[PDB]
Every structure is written in structure tokens, then in C-alpha cells.
């Protein structure tokens, strides 16, 4: 009974990892975004772009 | 890259009144004489006969 115990904890772990590696996997490139977004808002303070730019 | 860390340019209107020359003038006037002159010659009107 101990040893299913323990097996069991393993597999709580896998299904566990399979989930949190794909978060940090989506969020890398969700945070590459924000960083490239904040780059652009800091392009629109030019004070000397044309309305269409 | 912070809100608010600029550095700013002033800008003038700069043109012939703000500077106060539009009428820079020099000229002396002119005396002023007129002769009537004669108009002769006959026109054509609109109306019909």
C-alpha cells in the first residue's frame, strides 16, 4: 500500500509538470510582447510625428 | 524611458508683422494732379429693338 502511495504521488507530479512548463513556456513570449509594446509606447512620445505616422 | 524624462523645443512665429517690418516703407508721397479726360465711343446694351 505504501508503494501505491508513492506511485501515486508520481503521477500526481507528472500531470502537475506537464502543466506549470507550458505557463512559463506561453508567458516568455507573452513578457517578449509587453517588453516590445513598451518600446513602441516609448516611440510615441516623439514629439515630431505626423498624425498618420 | 520613463513618462515624463523629455527635454523640449520652443518654436516662434517668425514672419514680416512679428517682427514689425510688414509696413517698412520708404517712399517719399507724390504731388497729385488730374486733367479730365475726354471718353468718347458708343456702347452696345442688352435690350432688343
Known amino acids: 500500500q505504501a508503494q501505491a502511495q508513492n506511485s501515486q504521488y508520481a503521477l500526481a507530479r ?36 505626423s498624425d498618420d505616422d | ?19 514689425g ?3 517698412l516703407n520708404v517712399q517719399q508721397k507724390y504731388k497729385v494732379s488730374d486733367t479730365a479726360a475726354t471718353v468718347t465711343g458708343y456702347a452696345d446694351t442688352t435690350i432688343a429693338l
Open chain 2, 21 to 23: 517690418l510688414d509696413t
Open chain 2, 1 to 19: 524611458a520613463n513618462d515624463g524624462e523629455t527635454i523640449d523645443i520652443d518654436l516662434k512665429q517668425i514672419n514680416s508683422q512679428t517682427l
Open chain 1, 14 to 49: 507528472t500531470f502537475a509538470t506537464q502543466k506549470v512548463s507550458l505557463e512559463e513556456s506561453v508567458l516568455s513570449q507573452v513578457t517578449t510582447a509587453i517588453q516590445t509594446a513598451q518600446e513602441k509606447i516609448v516611440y510615441a512620445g516623439n514629439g515630431t510625428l
